[PDB]
Amino acid sequence: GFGDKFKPAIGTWDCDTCLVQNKPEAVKCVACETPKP
Amino acid sequence: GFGDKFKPAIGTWDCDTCLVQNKPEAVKCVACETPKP
Amino acid sequence: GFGDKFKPAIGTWDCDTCLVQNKPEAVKCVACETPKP
Amino acid sequence: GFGDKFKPAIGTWDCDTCLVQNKPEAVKCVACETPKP
Amino acid sequence: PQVQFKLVLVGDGGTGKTTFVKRHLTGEFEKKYVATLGVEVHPLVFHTNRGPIKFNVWDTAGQEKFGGLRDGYYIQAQCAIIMFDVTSRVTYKNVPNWHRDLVRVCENIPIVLCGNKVDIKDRKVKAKSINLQYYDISAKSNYNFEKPFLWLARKLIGDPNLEFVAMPALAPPEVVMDPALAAQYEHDLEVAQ
Amino acid sequence: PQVQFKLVLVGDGGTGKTTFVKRHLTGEFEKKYVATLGVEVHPLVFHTNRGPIKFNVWDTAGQEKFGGLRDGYYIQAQCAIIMFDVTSRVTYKNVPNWHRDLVRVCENIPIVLCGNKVDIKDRKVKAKSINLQYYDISAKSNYNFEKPFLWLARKLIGDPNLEFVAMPALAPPEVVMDPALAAQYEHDLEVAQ
Amino acid sequence: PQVQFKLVLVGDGGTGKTTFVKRHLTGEFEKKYVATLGVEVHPLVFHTNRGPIKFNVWDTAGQEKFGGLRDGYYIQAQCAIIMFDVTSRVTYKNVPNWHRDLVRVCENIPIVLCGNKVDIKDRKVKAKSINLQYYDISAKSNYNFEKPFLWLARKLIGDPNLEFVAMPALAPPEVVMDPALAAQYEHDLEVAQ
Amino acid sequence: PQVQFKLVLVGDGGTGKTTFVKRHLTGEFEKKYVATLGVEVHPLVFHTNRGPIKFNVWDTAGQEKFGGLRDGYYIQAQCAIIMFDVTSRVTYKNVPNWHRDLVRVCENIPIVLCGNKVDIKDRKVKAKSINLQYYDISAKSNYNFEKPFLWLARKLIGDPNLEFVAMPALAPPEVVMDPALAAQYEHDLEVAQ
Ligand SMILES: Nc1nc2c(ncn2[C@@H]2O[C@H](COP(=O)(O)OP(=O)(O)O)[C@@H](O)[C@H]2O)c(=O)[nH]1
Ligand SMILES: Nc1nc2c(ncn2[C@@H]2O[C@H](COP(=O)(O)OP(=O)(O)O)[C@@H](O)[C@H]2O)c(=O)[nH]1
Numbered sequence: 034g035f036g037d038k039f040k041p042a043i044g045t046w047d048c049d050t051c052l053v054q055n056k057p058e059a060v061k062c063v064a065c066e067t068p069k070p
Numbered sequence: 071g072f073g074d075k076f077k078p079a080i081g082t083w084d085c086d087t088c089l090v091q092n093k094p095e096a097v098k099c100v101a102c103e104t105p106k107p
Numbered sequence: 108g109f110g111d112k113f114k115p116a117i118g119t120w121d122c123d124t125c126l127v128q129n130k131p132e133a134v135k136c137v138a139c140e141t142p143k144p
Numbered sequence: 145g146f147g148d149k150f151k152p153a154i155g156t157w158d159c160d161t162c163l164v165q166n167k168p169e170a171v172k173c174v175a176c177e178t179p180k181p
Numbered sequence: 182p183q184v185q186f187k188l189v190l191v192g193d194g195g196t197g198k199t200t201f202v203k204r205h206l207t208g209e210f211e212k213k214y215v216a217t218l219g220v221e222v223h224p225l226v227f228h229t230n231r232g233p234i235k236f237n238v239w240d241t242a243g244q245e246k247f248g249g250l251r252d253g254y255y256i257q258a259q260c261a262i263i264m265f266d267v268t269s270r271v272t273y274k275n276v277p278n279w280h281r282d283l284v285r286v287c288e289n290i291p292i293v294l295c296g297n298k299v300d301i302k303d304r305k306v307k308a309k310s311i312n313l314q315y316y317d318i319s320a321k322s323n324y325n326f327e328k329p330f331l332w333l334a335r336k337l338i339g340d341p342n343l344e345f346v347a348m349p350a351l352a353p354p355e356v357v358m359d360p361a362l363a364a365q366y367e368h369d370l371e372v373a374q
Numbered sequence: 375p376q377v378q379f380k381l382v383l384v385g386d387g388g389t390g391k392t393t394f395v396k397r398h399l400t401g402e403f404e405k406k407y408v409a410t411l412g413v414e415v416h417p418l419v420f421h422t423n424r425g426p427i428k429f430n431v432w433d434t435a436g437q438e439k440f441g442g443l444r445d446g447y448y449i450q451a452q453c454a455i456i457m458f459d460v461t462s463r464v465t466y467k468n469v470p471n472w473h474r475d476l477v478r479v480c481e482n483i484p485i486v487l488c489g490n491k492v493d494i495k496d497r498k499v500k501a502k503s504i505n506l507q508y509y510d511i512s513a514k515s516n517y518n519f520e521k522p523f524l525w526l527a528r529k530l531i532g533d534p535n536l537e538f539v540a541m542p543a544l545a546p547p548e549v550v551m552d553p554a555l556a557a558q559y560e561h562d563l564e565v566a567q
Numbered sequence: 568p569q570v571q572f573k574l575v576l577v578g579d580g581g582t583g584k585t586t587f588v589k590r591h592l593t594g595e596f597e598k599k600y601v602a603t604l605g606v607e608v609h610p611l612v613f614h615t616n617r618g619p620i621k622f623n624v625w626d627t628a629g630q631e632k633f634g635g636l637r638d639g640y641y642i643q644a645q646c647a648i649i650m651f652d653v654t655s656r657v658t659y660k661n662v663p664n665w666h667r668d669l670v671r672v673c674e675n676i677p678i679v680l681c682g683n684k685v686d687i688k689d690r691k692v693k694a695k696s697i698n699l700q701y702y703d704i705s706a707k708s709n710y711n712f713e714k715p716f717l718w719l720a721r722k723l724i725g726d727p728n729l730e731f732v733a734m735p736a737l738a739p740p741e742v743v744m745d746p747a748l749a750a751q752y753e754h755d756l757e758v759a760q
Numbered sequence: 761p762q763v764q765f766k767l768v769l770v771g772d773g774g775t776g777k778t779t780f781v782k783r784h785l786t787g788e789f790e791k792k793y794v795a796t797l798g799v800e801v802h803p804l805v806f807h808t809n810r811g812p813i814k815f816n817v818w819d820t821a822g823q824e825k826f827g828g829l830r831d832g833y834y835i836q837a838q839c840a841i842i843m844f845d846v847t848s849r850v851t852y853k854n855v856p857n858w859h860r861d862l863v864r865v866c867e868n869i870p871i872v873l874c875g876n877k878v879d880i881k882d883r884k885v886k887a888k889s890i891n892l893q894y895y896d897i898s899a900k901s902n903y904n905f906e907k908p909f910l911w912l913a914r915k916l917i918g919d920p921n922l923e924f925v926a927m928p929a930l931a932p933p934e935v936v937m938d939p940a941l942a943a944q945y946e947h948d949l950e951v952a953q
C-alpha cells in the first residue's frame with residue numbers, strides 16, 4: 034500500500050490553479066506563476 | 071442539459087472544509103464555522 | 108423452479124429438423140413434415 | 145476464419161450420446177459403444 | 182425435456198429480423214435450416230433466476246418480401262415478435278396486418294412489437310404514434326436485445342418478476358446507441374402512455 | 375459552479391452507513407474531514423444523460439451511537455438517505471425518529487429509505503413491514519448502490535427519466551448478492567405495494 | 568460440422584471439477600449423460616474473433632474417488648484440463664500421476680493445469696511450488712474461468728492472438744475473489760517463473 | 761496528500777488529445793483552466809490494487825497547431841503521453857520531435873506513445889512502422905483507454921503487477937471498435953516486435 038515514500042517534502046503546497054506541487058519556499062507557483070494563498 | 075437554473079446566487083462561495091455553499095455576505099461557513107478565505 | 112408443469116405430454120418427441128414438439132402418435136413432424144426417426 | 149481444414153473426414157458422424165466423432169465405417173460409437181442411428 | 186418455446190419472428194423484409202436473431206451467438210452457431218419451409222430455427226437459450234429458458238426462433242429466408250409465409254411457419258408457435266423499421270413508415274403501417282395474420286392462425290399467444298434501428302438519428306416513427314408490449318430496439322447495437330425475450334418469458338411462465346441472471350454471448354455491437362438518445366426515447370414513450 | 379447537493383446519510387450506528395458511502399472510490403479518495411462537526415464529507419460524482427451531478431455526502435464519525443447529531447450536521451442539507459439494517463429490527467423501528475428528526479430541521483427535502491445488508495440470508499425485516507422511496511441495498515456487494523442516488527437525482531432535477539450513463543468506480547464486492555434472492559426480494563416488495 | 572473438441576477434465580475428487588464445468592450455464596442446460604461410462608458431457612461454446620469454438624467437456628460422476636477412469640473416458644480426447652485444489656496438497660501431488668495417465672493414453676494433446684479454490688485465503692499450494700500451462704482459478708467466483716479454454720483454443724487452432732470477443736453466460740458468482748489478492752497471486756507466479 | 765503525478769499529453773493538433781482526456785468523465789467535470797498557460801488540467805483518478813492514483817493531465821487549448829508550448833507547460837511533468845493519428849502519417853513522423861522536445865526539458869520521465877483513431881479501417885501507420893511503450897488506442901470507443909495510464913502507474917510506482925481494480929466512469933463510446941480488428945492489430949504488433 035503506497036505511497037510510502039511518495040509523500041512530498043514537508044510544507045509542500047499544491048497550486049489551486051494548476052495544481053503543481055510547490056516547494057515550501059515558493060511564493061508563486063513554479064509552473065503557472067499564481068501566488069500562494 | 072442542466073443546471074440552468076440550478077446555479078447559485080451571484081457571489082456564492084463554497085466552504086473549503088465542508089463544502090457547503092455560503093451566501094456572499096457570510097464571513098464564516100454557516101455549517102462548520104470555518105472562516106471564508 | 109419451473110417447469111413443473113411445463114413438461115410435455117408423455118411420449119412427446121422433438122423434430123430434429125425444426126425442432127417442433129410432436130404428439131406421440133405423429134409419424135411426421137406437424138410443422139415441417141420430416142418423418143420421425 | 146477457421147476451420148478450414150478442421151472439418152472432419154467425409155462421412156464422419158457424431159455420436160448422439162457422447163458426442164464423439166466417429167469414422168464413417170464405425171457401427172458403434174468408439175468411446176461409448178452406442179450404435180449408429 | 183426441456184422448457185422450450187417456438188417463437189415466430191415476423192415483419193416486413195428489411196426491418197432487421199435476421200440481424201436481430203443473429204446477435205445471439207450460440208443460437209447462430211446452432212441454427213437449424215428447415216429446407217421444406219425456408220426457415221432457419223435459432224435455439225436461443227436465456228438464463229433466468231429460476232433456470233434456463235429456450236426460445237426456438239423461426240427466422241425467414243426472405244420470402245416475406247415476395248409473398249406470405251407458409252402455414253407450417255406458424256404451426257405450434259407459442260409466442261411472437263413482430264418487427265418494424267423505425268425509419269420506414271410502411272413497415273410500421275403493416276404491423277396490424279402482421280398482428281392479424283398471427284391472430285388468425287395462433288391465437289392469443291403473447292406478442293411483442295419491436296421498433297428496430299433506433300440507432301439511426303433520422304427517426305420517422307416516434308413514440309407518439311406507437312399481448313402487445315412495445316420496445317424500441319437496435320439490433321446492431323444490442324440495445325434492448327433482452328427485453329422482448331424477458332417480457333415473453335414473464336408472460337409465458339406467469340412470473341412478473343422473472344429476471345435474466347446472466348446475459349447470453351452477443352455479437353459485438355456494430356453501431357453505437359447514444360445513451361442520452363435512449364433516455365430521450367424512453368421519456369417520449371412514457372409521455373405517449 | 376457546480377451542480378452540487380449536500381446529502382445527509384443518517385440512521386443507527388452499525389447499519390452500514392460508512393461502508394456504503396465508501397463504495398464510491400473517488401469520493402473516498404477525495405473525502406474532507408470536518409473537524410469541528412465530526413464528519414467526513416464524500417464528494418460523490420455521478421454521470422447522467424444530462425451531465426454530471428455531485429452529491430456531497432455527510433457521513434458521521436460514529437457519534438450517533440452516543441448522542442444526537444449537531445445542527446451543523448443538518449445545515450443546508452438538500453436531500454437525505456436514512457439507512458437501517460435488515461437484520462436488526464431496532465434499527466428499522468427508529469426510522470420514523472430519523473425521519474421526524476430530519477423533517478424538524480430541513481424540511482420537505484427528498485428522502486430515500488435504504489434497508490442495508492440484504493446479502494444476509496437471515497433477514498428479519500421483510501418487505502411486508504416496509505419523499506419516502508424505499509430500496510433494499512447491500513453495501514458490501516454494491517447491490518442497488520446507484521438507486522438511492524438516481525432516485526434523488528430524478529427528484530432534485532425534476533426529470534423522471536434521468537439515467538446514469540456510466541457507473542462510478544466502486545469498491546470490488548466483498549460479499550456476493552445472490553441474483554435469485556434479489557429477484558425474490560423484488561417480488562416481495564411488489565407484493566407489499 | 569462443426570469446430571468441436573473433446574476436452575477431458577481430470578484431477579482428484581473434491582478439487583472442484585463439476586463446480587467448474589457448471590459455471591457455463593448453456594453447457595449445463597445441454598449436458599448429455601453417458602450412461603455406459605458414468606460421464607456428463609457439457610458442450611461449451613466459446614466465441615472467438617474467428618468464430619465459434621465448441622469444447623465438449625467430459626466430467627466424471629465421481630468415480631475418480633473410488634478407482635481409475637475407463638479407457639472410453641479418454642478415447643478421442645483432443646485436449647485436457649487437470650485440476651487440483653490449492654488448499655489440499657495431496658491433490659497437487661497427484662498432478663504428475665494425472666499427467667502421466669493422460670500421456671499414456673493420448674498423447675501430446677495440449678493440457679492446462681488449474682489450481683482451484685484460490686478464493687480461500689488459507690492457501691497451501693503457492694506459486695513457488697507450481698503443453699503444461701498453469702492458471703490459478705476459482706470456480707465459484709468465475710475467476711480466470713476463460714483462461715484454460717482460451718489457451719487451449721490458441722494451442723489447438725495455432726493462433727497465439729486468438730481472443731474471446733464475448734463471454735458465455737456464467738453462473739452468478741457464489742463467492743468473491745479479492746482483486747488485490749488476485750494481483751498478489753499474479754505477482755507470485757511472475758516471481759516463480 | 762496525495763499520490764499525484766503531472767502528466768503532459770502532447771502530439772500534433774488533431775490527433776485526438778482533447779477527445780482522449782475527456783473520456784474520463786469526472787476529470788472533465790473537475791478540470792481546471794490555467795489562464796496564463798492555455799491549459800486545462802484534468803485530474804484523472806484511477807484505482808489500483810494498492811489504492812488510488814491521480815494523474816493531473818495537462819491538455820493544450822490548441823496552441824500546438826500554431827507554435828511550440830511554453831516551458832511552464834512542461835514544468836514538473838513526471839510522465840507523458842505522446843499521441844499521434846494512425847490515419848495521418850505526418851503526425852507519426854513528428855513523434856521523435858515531440859519525444860526529443862520532452863527529453864530536452866524533463867528528462868527520463870516515463871513516456872507512452874499512443875496511436876489514436878485505430879477505429880478507422882483506412883489505417884496508414886501500421887505496426888510494421890511503430891520509456892517508450894506503444895499502444896493502439898481509439899479515444900472515441902475507449903479502446904485501450906486504461907493502458908497508457910496503467911503502464912505509467914506500473915513504471916512510476918515500480919510495481920510491474922499493479923492492476924486497476926475498478927474502471928473510472930468513461931464517456932459512452934461514440935464509435936465502435938471491432939474486436940476482430942483489435943485482435944488483428946494485436947497480432948501485427950506481436951509480429952513487429
Ligand atoms: N442502423 C441499423 N441497421 C440495421 C439494424 N438492423 C438491421 N439493419 C440493417 O437493415 C438491413 C436489413 O437487415 P435484415 O436483417 O436482413 O432484415 P430482415 O429482412 O427483416 O431479415 C440490413 O442492411 C441491416 O444491416 C439496426 O439495428 N440498425
Ligand atoms: N453483510 C453485510 N455487512 C455489512 C454491510 N454493510 C456494512 N456491514 C457491516 O456492518 C458493520 C457496521 O458498518 P459501518 O459502516 O461502520 O456502519 P455505520 O455505523 O452505520 O457507519 C460493519 O461490521 C460492516 O462490515 C452489508 O451490506 N452486508
Ligand SMILES: Nc1nc2c(ncn2[C@@H]2O[C@H](COP(=O)(O)OP(=O)(O)O)[C@@H](O)[C@H]2O)c(=O)[nH]1
Binds near residue numbers: 585587683686707
Ligand atoms: N471455496 C471454493 N470452493 C469450491 C470451489 N470449487 C468447488 N468448491 C467446493 O469444493 C467441493 C468439491 O466440488 P466438486 O465440484 O464436486 O469437485 P469434484 O469432485 O472435483 O467434481 C464442493 O464442496 C464445492 O462447493 C471454489 O472455486 N472455491
Ligand SMILES: Nc1nc2c(ncn2[C@@H]2O[C@H](COP(=O)(O)OP(=O)(O)O)[C@@H](O)[C@H]2O)c(=O)[nH]1
Binds near residue numbers: 876
Ligand atoms: N474516428 C476517430 N476520430 C477521433 C478520435 N479521437 C478524436 N477524433 C477526432 O479527431 C479530431 C481531432 O480531435 P481533438 O481531440 O480536438 O484532437 P487534438 O487537437 O489533438 O486535441 C476531432 O474531429 C475528433 O472528433 C478517435 O479515436 N477516432
Ligand SMILES: [Mg+2]
Binds near residue numbers: 198242243
Ligand atoms: Mg431476414
Ligand SMILES: [Mg+2]
Binds near residue numbers: 391392434435
Ligand atoms: Mg459510520
Ligand SMILES: [Mg+2]
Binds near residue numbers: 627628
Ligand atoms: Mg465431480
Ligand SMILES: [Mg+2]
Binds near residue numbers: 777779
Ligand atoms: Mg485539443
Ligand SMILES: [Zn+2]
Binds near residue numbers: 050051052063
Ligand atoms: Zn500553478
Ligand SMILES: [Zn+2]
Binds near residue numbers: 099104
Ligand atoms: Zn463549512
Ligand SMILES: [Zn+2]
Binds near residue numbers: 123124125127136141
Ligand atoms: Zn419439424
Ligand SMILES: [Zn+2]
Binds near residue numbers: 163164174177178
Ligand atoms: Zn458415443
